[PDB]
């Protein structure tokens, strides 16, 4: 089929920086000219910034510029601004006189760079209200940290858990540019009351922080 | 003046079909060719097919066997039909003139199509209670566990919107049961756990259910 690739998939930059996102199509695009760059922010629909390689649409700041030809194309942001942090997609038109196709790159997420910040770690036992239902949800909160990459591990009586937890991470905060993560360990009420020590370990580089509670002990 | 109003979709059973239409306003649907695009939760954009201005439909290799794109000039609409849907077809579907080499670009607002056998049900909101004695330097973390609801989405506020600082509502995860589950937390001064009331307001419009849960300490 037709496939488009962008480089990088993710990049951290600061305000004022110069950003360059490349995009290569597996084959030459329609008329060596039909490529547009889109901008999408969390919870919002994609917004087109550039069309026909280099044409800027009305209202798009001039700091955005597009270049390339045929198979290779590049998005350039001369001076990165706060409103520019988002995911960018290249989309190319293909086909012949008898067929027509489109394809998207995988997207490039532009996040804001900032100083390392350790998470404030909290661990919540399953509420008594829930334990009546027969299921135990243990929740571990990594609050306001950076960078996004973090390894969360659960221990029940110092036994490494696997396959019984799901993770969710927020988008970069508007104010302090940090991330937060929520990991939920799911156990039956029976298994939960069969153990005592519950611990959530957060490893980031050379540091591992483990928050613990003992079932029953307020 | 110009708009593209999308409608249809919602819930589809595995093996069932979806039907989405888009009504153009301010212009004629025959004047341009229109694509159909989808974006699965937390994934990139994916092209489905394209209906040329001449009225000829062409599809991505992956969607050709199941997809049919038509238009109705009398009603000024373009329509997408996909049968034999599977769980991985869950996504936000868009109609759009992508405008890769022309000046005119326009998208529908997008509509979520959830492919699942699960039945619509509201969430069970459990408290993530804070301990009265803080073990995090005078700060307390509290929240609500919005668990076992279907389909997306749910909205969460705190104290009827009066509490926004420090709030983190995490993206939902799809549990093995087919139901969704997300957490919403907030950090507050531990000294306010006796003077301040904390209530999370969870709204699940797909089930016409609104849940308010007072989160108490200890």
């Amino acid at each position: 089929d037709i496939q488009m690739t962008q480089s990088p998939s993710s990049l951290s930059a600061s305000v004022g920086d110069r950003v360059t996102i490349t995009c290569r199509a597996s084959q030459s695009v329609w008329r060596n000219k039909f490529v547009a760059w889109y901008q999408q922010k969390p919870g919002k629909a994609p917004k087109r910034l550039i069309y026909a390689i280099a044409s800027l649409y009305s209202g798009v700041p001039s700091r955005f510029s597009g270049s390339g030809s045929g198979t290779d194309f590049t998005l350039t942001i001369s001076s990165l601004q706060p409103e520019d942090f988002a995911t960018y997609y290249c989309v190319g038109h293909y086909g012949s006189e008898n067929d027509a196709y489109y394809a998207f790159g995988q997207g490039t997420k532009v996040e804001i760079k900032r100083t390392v910040a350790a998470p404030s770690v909290f661990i919540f036992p399953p509420s008594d209200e829930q334990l009546k239902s027969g299921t135990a949800s243990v929740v571990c909160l990594l609050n306001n940290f950076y960078p996004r990459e973090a390894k969360v591990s659960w221990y029940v009586d110092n036994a490494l858990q696997s396959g019984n937890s799901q993770e969710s991470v927020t988008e970069q905060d508007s104010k302090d540019s940090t991330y937060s993560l929520s990991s939920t360990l799911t156990l039956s009420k029976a298994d939960y009351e069969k153990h005592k020590v519950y611990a959530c370990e957060v490893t980031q580089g050379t540091t591992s922080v483990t928050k613990s509670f003992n079932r029953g002990e307020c | 003046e110009v708009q593209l109003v999308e409608s249809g979709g919602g819930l589809v059973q595995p093996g069932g079909s979806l039907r989405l239409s888009c009504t153009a306003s301010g212009f004629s649907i025959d004047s341009y060719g229109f694509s159909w695009v989808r974006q699965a939760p937390g994934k990139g954009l994916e092209h489905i097919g394209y209906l040329t201005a001449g009225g000829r439909a062409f599809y991505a290799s992956w969607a050709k066997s199941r997809s049919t794109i038509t238009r109705n000039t009398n009603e000024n609409t373009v329509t997408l039909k996909m049968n034999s849907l599977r769980a991985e077809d869950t996504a936000v579907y868009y109609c759009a003139k992508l405008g890769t080499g022309s000046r005119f670009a326009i998208w529908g607002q997008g509509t979520l199509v959830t492919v699942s056998s699960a039945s619509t049900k509201g969430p069970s909101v459990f408290p993530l209670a804070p301990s009265s004695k803080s073990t995090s330097g005078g700060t307390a973390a509290l929240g609500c566990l919005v668990k076992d609801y279907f389909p997306e989405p749910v909205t969460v506020s705190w104290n009827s919107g009066a509490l926004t600082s420090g709030v983190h509502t995490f993206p939902a995860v799809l549990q093995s049961s087919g139901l969704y589950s997300l957490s919403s937390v907030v950090t507050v001064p531990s000294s306010s756990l006796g003077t301040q009331t904390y209530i999370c307001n969870v709204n699940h419009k797909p089930s016409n259910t609104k849940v308010d849960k007072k989160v108490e300490p200890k």
């Binding site: 329609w30 008329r31 039909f34 038109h93 293909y94 086909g95 012949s96 006189e97 008898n98 067929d99 027509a100 196709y101 | 060719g33 394209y50 040329t52 201005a53 001449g54 000829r56 062409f58 080499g101 022309s102």
Partner: peptide, 6 residues
Amino acid sequence: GHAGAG
């Protein structure tokens, strides 16, 4: 100006 127009 687009593809598939013959």
